[PDB]
Every structure is written in structure tokens, then in C-alpha cells.
């Protein structure tokens, strides 16, 4: 074969660390046989359009601490062995429509630490085998009923440091984490004044309302 | 063909020294092989670390990689129970394999 090592990475058994390496896009024409991508800590601010997917055995694939503003919807096409994604500390504010759709395996979900202000009902909508989602630290007032409905197998959630609005549209939040007690970090509300600091938890959902 | 026996822990991908600030998410890496799959554990100046794993109440977890992931640094001005030298340990019947230090530190 020729090479598929970037000079800036290490290959070893699949795995490739290009970690810290002042990368400001990813290195192109890697292993076939990947399962591993580390690209943390660089200075990647766009996914490209099927960035991913040539990589079909990948397993891991890890962008935090980039500076990344924008990802193509079909950055991770096609990938159906992808069992954990890292996307914190990045810039994010919007995830494109079908962003995760066919990631049936994964199995991680890090988006903590982004500017994320919305989320799609059908965000997590191929997501059945998740067990952690983390979307703390980010800028959602709200999340749409519903779109935690494919999160069959959700272990763990991180909902917290969100400025969320708890009315009448965050009601089915209340009542999906008083039967699922699975929001480990203290997700609390912003207003209403009567609600503010208080967690969503704790709050009795009459008295979601608008 | 080629088959895997079972082989004590060896450490392939050891911790690396990370500065975060007050706040922000961190994570320690720490991938072991061995067969059967190398439990792994965290310490902290020689202390052990708890996690999710022995605590649901928490801001740290064991990732199933073997991976410390902080959700969140934290670091007062008369509290600080995460900055400091880490090592893990990969453990199975056959061995132990312990890995460098990493410094977490706080800007």
C-alpha cells in the first residue's frame, strides 16, 4: 500500500492520534481500516460534507476542543459502527437536520460545551442505543416534546447550565424526568421568575404553564 | 486463522497532561488491552477516585474506554478536589499494568 499516516498523527493499530497538533482541518486519506479518530484539542472550525464516512469501521471518533462552528448534515453518513461521538468545547450552535441519522450503534454522545440554542425533534431520532448524552453547557431554552422519545436505552443525560424557560412547552420534561431520574447534573430553570434556580426535578409539572 | 488468548493489561494510550479552567469539561484517556478486558481505575496523588461508578451522584465518569471524563472543573477558592497528578491502573486475572502521571491543571 502507500501511506495513510499523516505526518502530524501516529498510527498504531488502527488507531490515529492527531492530537494537539494545531490541525485546522481534518487530515484526509486515513487507514481504510480506522477505528479510532483523535483529533482533540486542534483548531478545526467546519466539518465537511461526508467527512466520516469514507471510515466505515470507525468506532470513535473524538473533535473536542476544537473551535468548530458548523458540521455537514452528512458528516457522519453512513457509519453504523460508530459507537462514540465527542463534540465538546466547540462552538456549536445548531446541528443540521439528519446530523446523527443511521448511528444506530452509538452508544456516547458528548455536546457539552457549545453555543447549541435548538434542537431538532428529530435530533436523536435513529439514537435507540444511547446510554449518555451530555448537552450541558449550552444555550437551549427549550427542548421540543418528543425528542427524547428514541432514547430507549438512555442511561445518563447532562441537561444543566441551560438557560431553559420552564412554561407550558418544557411540561413533558418535568414528567419524562420525575419517571426517568436519569439527569445527573441539575438542570434548572431560567424563568419563569417563580421558577428561576429552582431544578426541573424538583418542580410538581402543574406548574409548567403558560 | 489467529486466535486471542487471554494476556494481562498493557497500556496503550497513557494520560496526558491537560490545563483546563474553572468550569470547563475534561477528560483523562487511558486505553489498556488485555483479554479478558482490563478493569480500570483512577488515582489521584495515590488516592482513589471516585466516579459515577462507586457515586451516581457526581460531575466525574468511567467511560466505558476506561476514560475520567469531568463534566465540569471544579475549582473554588477554598475547594479543589480535581486538579492534581493522575495515574490509572488496568487490572485482569492475569496482571496489573499501571500507567505515567498526568497533570490536571487549573488556569
Redesign the interface.
Known amino acids: 500500500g502507500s501511506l495513510h499516516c499523516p505526518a502530524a498523527c501516529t498510527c498504531?493499530?488502527n488507531?490515529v492520534?492527531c492530537?494537539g497538533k494545531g490541525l485546522t482541518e481534518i487530515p484526509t486519506n486515513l487507514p481504510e481500516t480506522i477505528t479510532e479518530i483523535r483529533l482533540?484539542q486542534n483548531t478545526i472550525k467546519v466539518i465537511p460534507p461526508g467527512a466520516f464516512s469514507p471510515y466505515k469501521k470507525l468506532r470513535?471518533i473524538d473533535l473536542?476542543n476544537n473551535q468548530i462552528s458548523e458540521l455537514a448534515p452528512d458528516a457522519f453518513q453512513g457509519l453504523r459502527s460508530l459507537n462514540?461521538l465527542?463534540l465538546?468545547?466547540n462552538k456549536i450552535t445548531e446541528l443540521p437536520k439528519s446530523l446523527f441519522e443511521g448511528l444506530f450503534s452509538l452508544?456516547?454522545l458528548?455536546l457539552?460545551?457549545n453555543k447549541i440554542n435548538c434542537l431538532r425533534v428529530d435530533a436523536f431520532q435513529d439514537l435507540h442505543n444511547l446510554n449518555?448524552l451530555?448537552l450541558?453547557?449550552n444555550k437551549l431554552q427549550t427542548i421540543a416534546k418528543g425528542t427524547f422519545s428514541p432514547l430507549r436505552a438512555i442511561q445518563?443525560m447532562?441537561l444543566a447550565?441551560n438557560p431553559f424557560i420552564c412554561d407550558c412547552h418544557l411540561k413533558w420534561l418535568a414528567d419524562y424526568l420525575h419517571t426517568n431520574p436519569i439527569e445527573?447534573?441539575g438542570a434548572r430553570c431560567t424563568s419563569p421568575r417563580r421558577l428561576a434556580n429552582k431544578r426541573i426535578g424538583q418542580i410538581k409539572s402543574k406548574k409548567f404553564r403558560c | 486463522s489467529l486466535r486471542q488468548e487471554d494476556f494481562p493489561p498493557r497500556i496503550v494510550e497513557h494520560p496526558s497532561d491537560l490545563i483546563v479552567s474553572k468550569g470547563e469539561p475534561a477528560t483523562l484517556n487511558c486505553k489498556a488491552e488485555g483479554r479478558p478486558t482490563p478493569t480500570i481505575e483512577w488515582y489521584k496523588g495515590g488516592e482513589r477516585v471516585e466516579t459515577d461508578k462507586d457515586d451516581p451522584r457526581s460531575h466525574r465518569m468511567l467511560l466505558p474506554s476506561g476514560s475520567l471524563f469531568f463534566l465540569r472543573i471544579v475549582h473554588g477558592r477554598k475547594s479543589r478536589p480535581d486538579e492534581g497528578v493522575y495515574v490509572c491502573v488496568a487490572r485482569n486475572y492475569l496482571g496489573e499494568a499501571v500507567s505515567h502521571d498526568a497533570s490536571l491543571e487549573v488556569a
Do not use: K, M
Open positions: 498504531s493499530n488507531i492520534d492530537r482533540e470513535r473536542s462514540s465527542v465538546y468545547g452508544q456516547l458528548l457539552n460545551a449518555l451530555s450541558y453547557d445518563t447532562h447550565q445527573t447534573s
